[PDB]
Amino acid sequence: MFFINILTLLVPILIAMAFLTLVERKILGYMQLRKGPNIVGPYGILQPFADAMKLFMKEPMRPLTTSMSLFIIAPTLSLTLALSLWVPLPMPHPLINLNLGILFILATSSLSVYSILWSGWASNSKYSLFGALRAVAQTISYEVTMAIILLSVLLMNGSYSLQTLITTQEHMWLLLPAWPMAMMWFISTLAETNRAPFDLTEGESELVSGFNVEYAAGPFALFFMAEYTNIILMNALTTIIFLGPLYYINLPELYSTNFMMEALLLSSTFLWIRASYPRFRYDQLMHLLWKNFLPLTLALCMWHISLPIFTAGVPPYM
Amino acid sequence: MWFEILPGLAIMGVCLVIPGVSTAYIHKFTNGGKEKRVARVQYQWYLMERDRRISGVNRYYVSKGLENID
Amino acid sequence: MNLYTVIFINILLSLTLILVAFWLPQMNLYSEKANPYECGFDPTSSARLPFSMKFFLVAITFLLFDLEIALLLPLPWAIQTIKTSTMMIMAFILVTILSLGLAYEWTQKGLEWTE
Amino acid sequence: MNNYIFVLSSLFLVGCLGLALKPSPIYGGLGLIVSGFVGCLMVLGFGGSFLGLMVFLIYLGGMLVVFGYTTAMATEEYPETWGSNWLILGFLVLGVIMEVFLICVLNYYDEVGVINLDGLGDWLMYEVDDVGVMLEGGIGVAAMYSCATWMMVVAGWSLFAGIFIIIEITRD
Amino acid sequence: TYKYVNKKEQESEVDMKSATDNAARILMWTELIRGLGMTLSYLFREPATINYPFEKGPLSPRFRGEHALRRY
Amino acid sequence: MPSTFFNLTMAFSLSLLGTLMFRSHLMSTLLCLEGMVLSLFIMTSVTSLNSNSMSSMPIPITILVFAACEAAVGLALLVKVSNTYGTDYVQNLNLLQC
Amino acid sequence: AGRISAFLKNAWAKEPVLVVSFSVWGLAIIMPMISPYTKYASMINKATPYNYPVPVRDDGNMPDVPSHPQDPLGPSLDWLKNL
Amino acid sequence: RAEYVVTKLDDLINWARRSSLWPMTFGLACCAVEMMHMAAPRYDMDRFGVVFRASPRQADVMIVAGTLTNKMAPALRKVYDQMPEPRYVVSMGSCANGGGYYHYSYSVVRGCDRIVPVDIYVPGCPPTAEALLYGILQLQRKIKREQKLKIWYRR
Ligand SMILES: COC1=C(OC)C(=O)C(C/C=C(\C)CC/C=C(\C)CC/C=C(\C)CC/C=C(/C)CC/C=C(/C)CC/C=C(\C)CC/C=C(\C)CC/C=C(\C)CC/C=C(/C)CCC=C(C)C)=C(C)C1=O
Ligand SMILES: CCCCCCCCCCCCCCCCCC(=O)OC[C@H](COP(=O)([O-])OCC[N+](C)(C)C)OC(=O)CCCCCCCCCCCCCCCCC
């Protein structure tokens, strides 16, 4: 029965990210006074499947100046880390219940950064090298900020688990107690997912394609699947942590529905941000994080250290 | 118009509803109408192992009540 | 065992996808196709030369701040302590000296990308 | 399922052997990432997960900065992975054969009992409190905040002084 | 004649209310939210896309297309 | 546990041999240093978990903090070496013999 | 002071992140020292029973400790019940 | 019947390749101005499923839109060669077709078919964005007509 559970977690997530590509194209089009795809499917619903079939029936085109081992390892690594990151999320009962779920999330995200770096260095090209170095800078900045944000929020919570987050947000959201942490966490999830404004790793204008400039179809599709799965996951993690869905012990279906609605809203918010804003410079992203978010989040981490002590509202261990 | 995005949004909606609901139902089916009985600590794991030994069918979820005592 | 099986299933799924991607289509490989890209011209360098990054001090500071993160992370179990006054003072001192180091580096222009 | 920790320890030995054999630092950082993940799995198997996840996160950040530096300055035109010299591969397989030979010797010489083939997987976890709350790893690392404040303050001063040290070294 | 595009005439001094307004503009990302609202309005507008092979683009009788030789 | 501890001790020995035997790369030497550090961390963590020494569990965190400090200093010195020469070669830095 | 107020107002107009961070730092320092609930956190963590309460022998010379949990003696948690 | 199954599979792969056409972010002149006018909201190529990609590794069709200079021609040939195998060429405008207004110039390749094999020629100077979309759909029909699996099966 457990393999059936794995299938019912994995297959809907892959269909969800393919239709996330469709929804992104249509939302960007309708914000650009045009349409999305509406010819391939009845309403464009077959467009991601056509794109996937075309990408998997084009040749992968191994290059000459290329470390082949890392060149092959990196996209498979990215996809398996995206799915492994999807594993421990509770809706409201996780497939795999981890005590240190947030720590697992952080470790898997850093390993995904390593997948991007190894692809960029293995594809022995200058634009790939540029994309890899930009990824290094970006992950430095958002890694330190994300660690502080999660520390303060889970200090407001009890343990490092996520069912504890459900029980914490049973009565009220965490957005109202810590909304500045929610804003900085939203920006940090954008930086983690390498999304607009500060994508900077697949920068189509500064670079040609960044770290994917030598990846032809196939493993390029694997990288795209990993990126969009990470988009849905970061929005899902944001709505589990901050915008707590309604939980009732008798029925969890309304919890799943509320989680779905809020995750869809935050994914559409990501596409909205991409339509709205231009790109940062990757030194400006580092300056912005290390000069605005890091001092403010250090102060707010200190405030959330002091808050349960002076309010006597220390959360329980379990 | 703008409502043309709603088919893709609805497909994403059902594909996000399915995993959590399926996980809860599969947990109920595997644990016999109850939840997963997660064990964060050694005390909870000891309770699960004791229940597995008590049931006699080597399944912790087969709860034994006052019918075992005369 | 369960998490191990899910990890192996995801790894096997990614391997199956890339094996399908490599054995499905038709291959036609020649030298000009597999040459490095370089925007439609031959590359002058070998793309393995030194790059000379400009944020090296920020990277070392990131190492130190990551270990300060590792120090700060057992706080959810630290707040369950019986004393809580020395705990609060110690957390305040740790965050304050981390912030003082960041402020000193900012004043000394450490995070300014010296070219 | 008994020799899982032994398989992990052997993989850690292989990763440290590759790191000792010294590839290009890209592959050295790869080997250290693999060894860090394997050591995290070993700590998780032996007990609390906080120490393993901590060392994993720390080495992820460390090898990321290492990757940036070996791209910046510690690079060459042909970075050798392992096959530029056949001596490196021959020495890797020689070390593997020597590892197998030594563990077979220590299994045959079962008087001391450091490594036993039949007794492997029997003495991994010695004694555990079956009933009990708050006995996992991370409670002690929290007790650094209350019971070892000297450890906490020397670590904090090390990081603070290290910030000053690195600024003064790279002042130029 | 001419005009300036970025020059300011004198200054608005320093005031607590103006300082609070600038602080809220910086912290609450007000111009970013305004740009979000603008592209949201564009989302709820009607697209200008025509269904191509069935609805052709408009033209003029002066249009230069394919050459032809005529007859009396 | 004794087999695993023997393997960890041999891993430390291999990383020490890597530190002692140079191959033209100060960065590779620092990598061997951090491999020694990782081996010591795993040894200390396994020992504390086996002996249930929760009071001595802050020791791996302390060695990790000081090890990252020394890795930071080594990276800074490697930056200065690269600024001096441009190649980062331990045989190239040799001019203090006279 | 005029110069201090002008400097603070200019900092609040131009860099309203450092001002907020320093204010939050000062508030997190000050607030535990003036709150009346600060002792309650330590008392709650003391009263949380993670261990078994090991019984003591009855020598008959201690009247302070109870003889049964349903006794008026002992550290009652009515402060936490009404908190 | 193996012929029927092979024909339907070939139709499926042709449908995929014609519904997902990714041209390269590559133009040269006024014809590329009309190409991004075909990208404009009026004749939405993204509605057709046609979306530019900057890298030639992720491209499917090169839309040669502009004058192919002698100095430019090695770059165009290298960029075309760097594409993966199912690649197409749409020449656009008189310059890319046969040199056009600069046919007798000392520096202009008289048609981009001297350099790369051209699948579809789109006439005009410039061809309208409607005309370029017509050429794109004609290319879609052309690769709908392809029978690779059937030729392989009777090979
Ligand atoms: C005056 O001077 C000049 C210039 O200067 C100004 C010039 O510029 C210039 C050059 C001019 C040009 C080249 C003109 C070109 C036009 C433009 C530059 C402007 C047009 C606009 C853009 C380029 C921007 C486009 C913006 C957008 C928002 C569009 C979105 C585009 C995207 C790439 C993002 C969306 C993603 C996609 C389209 C693809 C997503 C889909 C996939 C990758 C599919 C992957 C999915 C899977 C693998 C899923 C598989 C899994 C499953 C489970 C499915 C199951 C399957 C089954 C079969 C069952 C010239 C010549 C010039 O003279
Ligand atoms: C997940 C929940 C939803 C989150 C929000 C999602 C929807 C909104 C999305 C908006 C668009 C985001 C796209 C990316 C934008 C990137 C740019 C950006 O945001 O830059 C950050 C900008 C940076 O601004 P900047 O860079 O222009 O600043 C200028 C600074 N110099 C001159 C040095 C360059 O803002 C911040 O950093 C602010 C962060 C949030 C601050 C929150 C403070 C709250 C109040 C605290 C307490 C106040 C009272 C004090 C105590 C009183 C006691 C009585």
Ligand SMILES: CCCCCCCCCCCCCCCCCC(=O)OC[C@H](COP(=O)(O)OCCN)OC(=O)CCCCCCCCCCCCCCCCC
């Ligand atoms: C392409 C190659 C990819 C290689 C890299 C693969 C990356 C995988 C995804 C990222 C993993 C990051 C590290 C995660 C470690 C596990 C996290 C964790 O907390 O595990 C502990 C957990 C149980 O602990 P706890 O939650 O406390 O439960 C006790 C009571 N419930 O659970 C456990 O104890 C389970 C322990 C095992 C879990 C990990 C299994 C990994 C298996 C090996 C994968 C790689 C194999 C080599 C390559 C294969 C070929 C490509």
Ligand code: SF4
């Ligand atoms: S054919 Fe005409 S419109 Fe097109 S590039 Fe040449 S001159 Fe410009």
